[PDB]
């Protein structure tokens, strides 16, 4: 439930499972 | 490397370190069979699922490479076991990881009905003030003495046996009904056994359900059977939601034939007090289907399920599997 | 026909049929020593009182014909025992009428702290909705496994022994501390005994109070002792309100040194969530001092107290009395 | 907690203990 | 009417009133397969037998009209189950009629080894006189304290579960070994489970046998395994005589590696102290295979066996049978 | 350096290392008060004694410097407590060192009477041979079923409470009689209490004695009371020999009113089967007063007694004593 | 019947001038009445009168016990009653005691001070045989303290 | 184990099972 | 109960309590 204040939503971290959500 | 998908989930911090050098892990976070990605339906070898999603025969036929399904838990009534066997799919589960957690939660609900504690705590938060002794006798009216009462159990399994041992320390008298057991099981534990469901309801002051949900016991507590119980009995349900007809239960609570009821599983989930046949029914206690959770239990069941997948990939089916439930139907 | 008065009460439907051909019954429904009628202070032979009124030496000197006081219950810390002996007044009580009722209520509070059930029920009524498994793990975060834990008991009396027997069926490890007992009591029950209070607090994961309120143990759980407990322990109090310093307890809950606390008796009564040092403290369960009530227990204790009065009137003091607590001080 | 709607509060029934409440 | 024969017996006072209007009852009082009358071998439909006679495949082929065999008891290791199925003969037994009698007898033998009582009584009859305290410490040398010891059980069946519950009240620590059980059975009863036989013997101070005599466990306690036990352990056997090699046991008792042994069943019966490998072995207790007898148990098992015959005659095989053990092999 | 004497004993290997730098140790190995050396009667400060020697008022007056007597055990009925107080002598004992050893021995005797095991073992050594089932039913005739029976206990002390807990695991129904206890002790343990000795004997199938030998209960089981027991009851005695009249017990066994009896203490010791009123009485089990011995228990009680002497010498009487039994009578 | 269904006492109260109008007043003046069915009746001495009482008491639902040491075996089988062997056992399990024995020299003051304490809490007592079988001094104390509910 | 002193061992009582012992 | 074959019953070892038996 941690608030996602990730303003600069970049993708320099591929750290885990592959997200295949639709 | 093959692909393994978590059908309904987002967190995979425990399974990832195990299945990292033998397969590829992915998650879908789906809520229905129509929300599964097309890649999963074509390139999936194994799957992991909780109790929040139901698979039918039509859903199973859409998979083209599935070989094994592992259920994280003890219940598998949401999967068509017989149909999966014909298609050549094996089904596994974790038999006993939360036996003692569920038994303790059942005893907690029983004590709340006799020694009213949740209702007394709720009254104080609403602003009720009690000062004199006469006021105390009125707010807590209905409490009873446990010793000398009779407890009825339907289904003497792993959880059923655990509850029976703990109930004898409080002075209860224990009966049980189970038609699939052998002879002399009650002799070892020193219990009493009946032969018909009607006989159990006639001589019981509190009824608890611990059986499984097969196709011969849907709506076991129906309208006809609910009238065979005693005047002013209790009812505890922590096994499955399909065993109780909620429409008939609501009428019994209003008329006063049933003093109270504690429920942990419901026909329709998630549960809300403002919707359903139980919208306005007195003397009701409900929990959000969390009679199994524990810090140690959660980690134990997730690690065991992950290791079951690894054995299947690096072995043979179903020789290498430990807990297989459709071995007879498998071809 | 002598006069017998009920100091704090209005209902006398049980005592009247017994004391109708030997005395005259009356009630005062008083809340303080200043609300007692003048006729009672001059023409009263016996009296009956609950725990809601306190009598001191100055109050006792105002009576001119009192000879016996009978306390409906097991505690007599609200009456000056030594002072009444000098004036020539006998004090009686009902020793054991709700031993098993109080023991069952203590076990109910213990299970609520481990298997969170009152808090989960409260959340649903506030409108919280939980659907996914991740949401379930968050709302019910904090539940633990009972087996393997250590339970500490302070005072092994009638209630203390009853709790110990029931706690062993769940897998607890039981210790106790009592400096007024003889040697070998733990051998019979198969328990473990310590010699100092500090040693008990160091090795306990849950502490329950079952001692009496004498003059050597006021504020037993004070500021200094509350810092000797483990990190993240529980606390249950159902004996008396004067054994715990509520000001120090509130700070411990906020900082997180104590995971939770269940209370049935408080320093100031009646209790309200909007007043007192515990106005805003997380993880708190409270009940309105009703750990003794039962349909059978209420009738049993009222009849026994009435028959104690009749023996004193038609006999000799204190030869005819069965439960006298100030026999040594009586002159 | 029964509501006392005893409008004609008469005293034709002396049925119990003597009330000495102040 | 058909003929029913009792192979090894003379008394038929209980079975006669039941099987009098449906069949003809007869007895043979035979001690071997060569003492059966010729009429029985040609005109017998059913038979009743105790544990004193053994039937092989050659013996079964001599019968020309046999259809059902009922064993009065719980063990059927003296009948070739697989061979009887091919010939078209059904085998039945009484599963649980002396569960509690056997469990009580097992506990009696355990207490005699720790608190020496049979040996002390035997010494007095021989004329031994003890007066001083020093003499008392010498005649009763070897007694130990029960609390804190470890008890090992081989086979957790009906009798095995009954023994485990009673042993916990004395302070024992219980382990068990069973390779044919499912997962989580120990969770319900709160016991501890091991995976290998060698591990059980390493950490046990007293070993009890409660398994069955199949073809994979003949001479389970052989010469090699008896050297893996602890220094100065006990041994109790009440299941079957073929599970223990008596030749190796005698040497262990003499050298002192085993402190004592209590036996109820032996390889060769009847047992005599003057014959066999155990002719001169210290610290031995023996009983004449009577761990099942009781006034109520004897009547119950004889009536149940008689009613099983009547259902087969006036019904269909094996649909009307309740306890059939060769249903899979039956053709 | 003062002198400490062991009145009846020869071995002092445990007490010597403790009392070597504060006193001088000596032993007498006496069997009567007339075999005490003259030096002891004049220069003895403390003494240690077992149960084999009795001291009266005349014997106590012969000592000129005795100040303390320590009894190694729990019983002190062989010392005149009141007379020693007037002369200024303190008496001490070891209250609880063999509580569990005595409780286990009591249960062993109870099981031998129901499940005949000592008698069956004795028969085999005499040369009896049993082969057929009919012979088995005859040699072991008399065994009964434990579940459903009623157990009566006289005196609920340390040992009495231990026996009650263990007896409930076998299915017994427990009653007790004790006139010196408070109210509600049975509520904690969940037992049933009677008010008269006659009522206990009417509704009991097995009677066990666990009381003390004061001056108001000599020959408690006399001729008149032995006729109030049921037809075919048992009797177990392990407390003291003076509570049972052996002359009346022998007649009951012969006529058949009492099925059996197990005795550990007798009026005259040492016991011999060829002498006394019980010379020829069927169904009798006897042990040589060794229901307390254990390897751990023997060392524990001897060390505690030695340290009690050292505190008295290097302290003040009776402030430094922990277990004093004549404090009220001491002047 | 007068002890269970209070009738003499209710009639006596009316003549003294007591007035009862409301239902609450009725429950107070007639407080103490009980239900006959399910109770136990104890009889001491099964003679001519004793047998007649036993037959009539069974029609009301009583449970009948008796104690008589001078009778033969099987007398209770014919009448379908229950028999005890000691006087103490009869007093422990009885809610109403009636005396129908004779006054010989071995039963003077049969209901003495010691035996009156062995009866149940709140029992009745009826005596119509002889006056020497009951110690009136001990009976008076029992009535005042409340151990005996009533006596005829 | 009752001693069989049935001196006049006659057969005027056929009361039970058929004895087929060899 | 150890047999005392202490033929040369000398007293070169005073090792324990004082024996005051009569
Ligand atoms: N958090 C939760 O709510 C939770 C957690 C765990 C298990 N459960 C449920 O608990 C139930 C019992 O689990 P278990 O481990 O004891 O199961 P189990 O399979 O070990 O035993 C189930 C027992 O039910 C008996 N039974 C089956 N049909 C019956 C019928 N019609 N009438 C009576 N008895 C019948 C079976 O013979 C067996 O004895 C399951 O439904 C399981 O899904 C719920
Ligand atoms: N509804 C309620 O809240 C309720 C109901 C009943 C009793 N109680 C309270 O429960 C308490 C215990 O009742 P009980 O019947 O078990 O009492 P009890 O008198 O039978 O036993 C009390 C025990 O406390 C021990 N003790 C005294 N001071 C002690 C100290 N400083 N430290 C440790 N132990 C000490 C005594 O030695 C004794 O063993 C009483 O305070 C009683 O008033 C509360
Ligand atoms: N009077 C007597 O001596 C007497 C009386 C009754 C029964 N018995 C004997 O008691 C034994 C047990 O009876 P029960 O009713 O408990 O039997 P059961 O069939 O109910 O249970 C037997 C158990 O043994 C286990 N087992 C089988 N082979 C094993 C092996 N190699 N190692 C470990 N465990 C193994 C099984 O899995 C099962 O759990 C039987 O041999 C029976 O004949 C003796
Ligand atoms: N090896 C042995 O034979 C052995 C060993 C230890 C103790 N004992 C004997 O066991 C007995 C009990 O020991 P304990 O430690 O339980 O004693 P305890 O003093 O702790 O308890 C004795 C109990 O007896 C009760 N009592 C006294 N007089 C009674 C009477 N007339 N009727 C009924 N109850 C009565 C007391 O009130 C008390 O409850 C003692 O006589 C002791 O000497 C024998
Ligand atoms: N108006 C009256 O008050 C009145 C009228 C008639 C008779 N009675 C009295 O009624 C009594 C009974 O008359 P009945 O005709 O039935 O007498 P009965 O002689 O026919 O029978 C008397 C019975 O008392 C039994 N009995 C004797 N001693 C006993 C004892 N110690 N304990 C128990 N039972 C004992 C006898 O064995 C016998 O069964 C007599 O005392 C008689 O005088 C009173």
- DSSP per-residue letters across F143-170: ----TT-EEEEE--SHHHHHHHHHHGGG
Closest CA to E160 of B188, F147, F108: B188
Edge-to-edge strands, sheet with C173-177: C192-193, C173-177, C150-154, C206-209, C233-237, C258-263, C284-286
**SS3 per residue for chain B:** CCEEEECCCCCCCCCCCCCCCCCEEEECCCCCHHHCCHHHHHCCCEEEECCCCCECHHHHHCCCCCCEEEECCCCCCCECHHHHHHHCCEEEECCCCCHHHHHHHHHHHHHHHHCCCHHHHHHHHCCCCCCCHHHHHHHCCCCCCCCCCEEEEECCCHHHHHHHHHHHHHCCEEEEECCCCCCCHHHHHCCEECCCHHHHHHCCCEEEECCCCCCCCCCCECHHHHCCCCCCEEEEECCCHHHECHHHHHHHHHHCCECCEEECCCCCCCCCCCCCCCCCCCCEEECCCCCCCCHHHHHHHHHHHHHHHHHHHCCCCCCCCCCECCCCCCC
Whether ligand 4 lies within 6 angstroms of the CB of F159 is answered as: yes
Contact F238, F264 (CB under 8 A): yes
Cis peptide before C318 (omega within 30 of 0): yes
CA–centroid distance, F137 to ligand 3, in Å, is: 23
Q: Which two tokens stand for residue C328?
A: 């040594």
DSSP assignment letter at G15: H
Distance from CA of E213 to the nearest CA of H (A): 31
Place of tokens 């089904």: B91
Contact E159, E99 (CB under 8 A): yes
Closest CA to B239 of B51, B88, B20, B38: B51
Cβ within 8 Å of residue C167, ≥6 positions away = C107, C110, C151, C174
Cβ within 8 Å of residue E136, ≥6 positions away = E130, F288, F289, F290, F293
Find chain E residues with C-beta within 8 A of B183's C-beta: 95-96, 322-323
C43 SS3 class:
coil
Contact F65, F89 (CB under 8 A): no
Contact F75, F212 (CB under 8 A): yes
Containing H/E element for E139?
helix E133-139
State the Rg of chain G over Cα: 17
Whether ligand 3 lies within 6 angstroms of the CB of E105 is answered as: no
E269 is an active site residue: yes
Angle between helices C99-114 and B99-114 (to 10 degrees): 130
**F231/F322 Cα distance (integer angstroms):** 47
**DSSP string of F78-112, one letter each residue:** TB-HHHHHHHT-EEEE--SSSHHHHHHHHHHHHHH
E37 SS3 class:
coil
Binding residues of E for NAD(+): 74, 154-159, 178, 211-217, 238-240, 264, 289-292
Angle between helices C158-167 and C99-114 (to 10 degrees): 40
Cβ within 8 Å of residue I2, ≥6 positions away = none
Cβ within 8 Å of residue C104, ≥6 positions away = B111, B114, B115, B146, B170
Cβ within 8 Å of residue E304, ≥6 positions away = E94, E97
The terminus-to-terminus CA distance of chain I in angstroms comes to 21
Find chain B residues with C-beta within 8 A of C294's C-beta: 143-145
Closest CA to B94 of B77, B78, B81, B75: B75
**F330/F326 Cα distance (integer angstroms):** 6
Cβ within 8 Å of residue B321, ≥6 positions away = B90, B92, B308, B311, B312
Contact B165, E189 (CB under 8 A): yes
The b/e string for G103-132 (b: 16+ C-beta within 10 A; e otherwise) is eeeebeebbeeeebebbbeebbbbbebeee
The angle subtended at Cα E39 by Cα E33 and Cα E42, nearest 5°, is: 85
**F276/F247 Cα distance (integer angstroms):** 9
Q: Which two tokens stand for residue G141?
A: 């104390």
Place of tokens 């209905």: B142
The b/e string for B230-253 (b: 16+ C-beta within 10 A; e otherwise) is beebbbbbbbbbebbbbebbbebb
CA dihedral B202, B204, B208, B209 (to 10 degrees): -20
**C285/C234 Cα distance (integer angstroms):** 12
- Residues F240, F259, F266, F302: which is the catalytic one? F240
Q: Which two tokens stand for residue F303?
A: 């060390």
For residue E193, count CB atoms less than 10 angstroms from its CB and return exposed for 0-12, middle for 13-18, buried for 19 or more: middle
CA–centroid distance, E211 to ligand 3, in Å, is: 4
Give the domain ranges of chain G. 1-152
Q: Which two tokens stand for residue C248?
A: 């120090």
Contact E246, E269 (CB under 8 A): no
Distance from CA of G60 to the nearest CA of C (A): 27
Cβ within 8 Å of residue G11, ≥6 positions away = none
Find chain E residues with C-beta within 8 A of C190's C-beta: 147, 171
Q: Which two tokens stand for residue C202?
A: 């160091």
The b/e string for F260-279 (b: 16+ C-beta within 10 A; e otherwise) is bbbbbbbbeebbbeeeeebe
Q: How far is CA C2 from CA C45, C59, C309, E281, G31, in A?
A: 7, 21, 11, 84, 21
Contact C74, C93 (CB under 8 A): yes
Task: For residue I20, give the nearest of F13, F16, F28 by CB distance.
Answer: F28
Place of tokens 């009894």: F71
C&E contacts, CB < 8 Å: 4
Contact F216, F243 (CB under 8 A): no
DSSP assignment letter at E35: G
The terminus-to-terminus CA distance of chain E in angstroms comes to 26
E91 SS3 class:
strand
C289 is an active site residue: yes
Contact E162, B187 (CB under 8 A): yes
Give Cα B195 to chain centroid, integer Å: 24
Cβ within 8 Å of residue D9, ≥6 positions away = none
Cis peptide before D4 (omega within 30 of 0): no
Closest CA to B112 of B250, B283, B271, B255: B283
Contact C27, C40 (CB under 8 A): no
Resolution in units of Å: 3.0
**C242/B24 Cα distance (integer angstroms):** 62
Find chain I residues with C-beta within 8 A of F39's C-beta: 20
E158 and B100: CB-CB below 8 Å? no
Q: Pick the atom of ligand 5 nearest to G48's CA.
A: 16
Q: Which two tokens stand for residue C183?
A: 């040697």
Closest CA to G132 of G152, G114, G113, G107: G107
**F311/F5 Cα distance (integer angstroms):** 16
Range 4-33 of F in CB contact (< 8 A) with I: 5-6, 12-13, 16, 24-30
> Could you say which ligand is closest to the alpha carbon of residue C290?
2
- Residues F15, F289, F302, F308: which is the catalytic one? F289
Q: How many residues does chain A have?
A: 22
Chains F and I contact (Cβ–Cβ under 8 Å for 3 or more pairs):
yes
C315 and G145: CB-CB below 8 Å? yes
Cβ within 8 Å of residue B294, ≥6 positions away = B98, B101, C143, C144, C145
E&F contacts, CB < 8 Å: 165
**F306/F292 Cα distance (integer angstroms):** 19
CB atoms within 10 A of CB C132: 16
Task: For residue B120, give the nearest of C104, C288, C294 by CB distance.
Answer: C288
CA–centroid distance, G104 to ligand 5, in Å, is: 10
Cβ within 8 Å of residue C189, ≥6 positions away = C161, C164, C165, F161, F165
Q: Which two tokens stand for residue B304?
A: 């065991």
Containing H/E element for C107?
helix C99-114
CB atoms within 10 A of CB F282: 9
Find chain G residues with C-beta within 8 A of D2's C-beta: none
F10 touches chain E (CB under 8 A): yes
H22 and E16: CB-CB below 8 Å? no
The terminus-to-terminus CA distance of chain H in angstroms comes to 21
**E24/E287 Cα distance (integer angstroms):** 36
Closest residue, chain D, to C40 (C-alpha): D20
F289 is an active site residue: yes
E83 SS3 class:
helix
Phi first, then psi: give them for residue F215, nearest 5 degrees. -90, 0
Contact E303, E70 (CB under 8 A): no
C125 SS3 class:
helix
Cis peptide before E318 (omega within 30 of 0): yes
Which of left, alpha, beta for F114 (phi over 0: left; psi -120 to 50: alpha)?
alpha
**C282/C181 Cα distance (integer angstroms):** 37
Chains E and B contact (Cβ–Cβ under 8 Å for 3 or more pairs):
yes
Give Cα B260 to chain centroid, integer Å: 20
Residues β-bridged to residue F4? F25, F46
Contact F220, F245 (CB under 8 A): no
G128 SS3 class:
coil
- Residues B116, B259, B289, B302: which is the catalytic one? B289
Which of left, alpha, beta for F240 (phi over 0: left; psi -120 to 50: alpha)?
beta
């Amino acid at each position: 439930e941690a608030l996602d204040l990730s303003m600069k939503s970049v993708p320099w971290l591929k750290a885990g499972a592959l997200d295949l959500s639709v | 490397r093959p692909l393994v998908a978590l059908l309904d989930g987002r967190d995979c911090t425990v399974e990832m370190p195990i299945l990292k050098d033998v397969a590829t892990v992915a998650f879908c976070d789906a809520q229905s069979t129509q929300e599964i990605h097309e890649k999963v339906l074509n390139e999936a070898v194994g799957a992991l699922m909780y109790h929040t999603i139901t698979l039918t025969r039509e859903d199973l036929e859409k998979f083209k490479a599935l070989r094994i399904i592992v259920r994280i838990g003890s219940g598998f009534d949401n999967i068509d076991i017989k149909s999966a066997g014909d298609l050549g799919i094996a089904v596994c589960n974790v038999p006993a990881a939360s036996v003692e957690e569920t038994a303790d939660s059942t005893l907690c609900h029983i004590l709340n009905l006799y020694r009213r504690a949740t209702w007394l705590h709720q009254a104080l938060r609403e602003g009720t003030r009690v000062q004199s002794v006469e006021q105390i006798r009125e707010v807590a009216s209905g409490a009873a003495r446990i010793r000398g009462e009779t407890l009825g159990i339907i289904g003497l399994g792993r959880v059923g046996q655990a509850v029976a041992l703990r109930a004898k320390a409080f002075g209860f008298n224990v009966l049980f009904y189970d038609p699939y057991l052998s002879d002399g099981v009650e002799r070892a534990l020193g219990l009493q056994r009946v032969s018909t469901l009607q006989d159990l309801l006639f001589h019981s002051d509190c009824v608890t359900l611990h059986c499984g949900l097969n196709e011969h016991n849907h709506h076991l507590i129906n309208d006809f059977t609910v009238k065979q119980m005693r005047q002013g009995a209790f009812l505890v349900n922590t096994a499955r939601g399909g065993l109780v007809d909620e429409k008939a239960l609501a009428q019994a609570l209003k008329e006063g034939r049933i003093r109270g009821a504690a429920l942990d599983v419901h026909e329709s989930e998630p549960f809300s007090f403002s919707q359903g046949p139980l919208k306005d029914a007195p003397n009701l206690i409900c929990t959000p289907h969390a009679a199994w959770y524990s810090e140690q239990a959660s980690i134990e069941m997730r690690e065991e399920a992950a290791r079951e997948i690894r054995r299947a990939i690096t072995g043979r089916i179903p020789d290498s599997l430990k807990n297989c439930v459709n071995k007879d139907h498998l071809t």
